[PDB]
């Protein structure tokens, strides 16, 4: 996360760290949506141009964490993957359209002060909150700068959703209805973006109607990090909710 701040303890209890086994490294962000299901970006698991194709057994999910590198004895929970489900029309060839994947854990994770699932939006949540100017929140252990570098603990930044024309005009990439972009404009003076290592992590919003946190987005792609005139792009969770429900109801 660039130009964000340290998270408070228990601020993001749905936060999930995708951790590589060997070599032991941060792979991506992700989120807890129930006691056995974790949501992330497909590109975190599958990206053939870079010969990325992680199997279940290649990694672990670490839940309840605050410090990036430390083993947080008695606080974090480490879980094994039972099965990875990537969106069957995830478009890694062209533009990362439908950048979303599910991970089923081998066993249920115990909820605690530090571990708790985020809500997924229904149609009216999306309609009500996914508005230009409305701010969401992005969290991760990703780099602090495009090129000081890595955080000691979980980072947080709030960012406004940006009008679709502005999003489109900021890039040569073909933008889809399964994407939104967020971030400040140069004219707004404030900064902040996700960055390398923040991928797959959640974009959340706190409904003012029922006071619950909803994950509207997944950190999916961007050009550089926190560049003037560029915006972070996010997988539009509600738009792919049908696929999400289909997966969990079937498996």
């Amino acid at each position: 996360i660039v130009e964000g701040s340290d998270a408070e303890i228990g601020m993001s209890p749905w936060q999930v760290m995708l951790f590589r086994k060997s070599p032991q490294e941060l792979l991506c962000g992700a989120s807890l949506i129930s006691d056995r299901w974790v949501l992330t970006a497909a590109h975190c698991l599958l990206y053939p141009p870079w010969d990325k194709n992680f199997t279940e057994n290649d990694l672990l999910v670490r839940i309840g964490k605050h410090s990036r590198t430390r083993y947080e004895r008695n606080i974090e929970k480490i879980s094994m993957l039972e099965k990875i489900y990537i969106h069957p029309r995830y478009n890694w060839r062209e533009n990362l359209d439908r950048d979303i994947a599910l991970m089923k854990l081998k066993k249920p994770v115990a909820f605690s002060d530090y571990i708790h699932p985020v809500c997924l939006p229904d149609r009216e949540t999306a309609a009500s909150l996914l508005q230009a100017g409305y701010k969401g929140r992005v969290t991760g252990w990703g780099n602090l700068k495009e090129t000081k570098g890595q955080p000691s603990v979980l980072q947080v930044v709030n960012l406004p959703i940006v009008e679709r024309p502005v999003c489109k005009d900021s890039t040569r990439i073909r933008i889809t209805d399964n994407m939104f972009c967020a971030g400040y404009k140069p004219d707004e003076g404030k900064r902040g973006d996700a960055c390398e290592g923040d991928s797959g992590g959640p974009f959340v919003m706190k409904s003012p109607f029922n006071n619950r946190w909803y994950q509207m987005g997944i950190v999916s792609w961007g050009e550089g990090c926190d560049r003037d005139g560029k915006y972070g792009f996010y997988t539009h969770v509600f738009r792919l909710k049908k696929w999400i429900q289909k997966v969990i109801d079937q498996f």
């Binding site: 951790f19 086994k21 032991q24 490294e25 941060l26 672990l60 590198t69 430390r70 083993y71 480490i78 094994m80 890595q150």
Partner: peptide
């Protein structure tokens, strides 16, 4: 960089 985790998890 990362602290090693309990072997049970690897």
């Amino acid at each position: 960089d990362f602290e090693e985790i309990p072997e049970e998890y690897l």
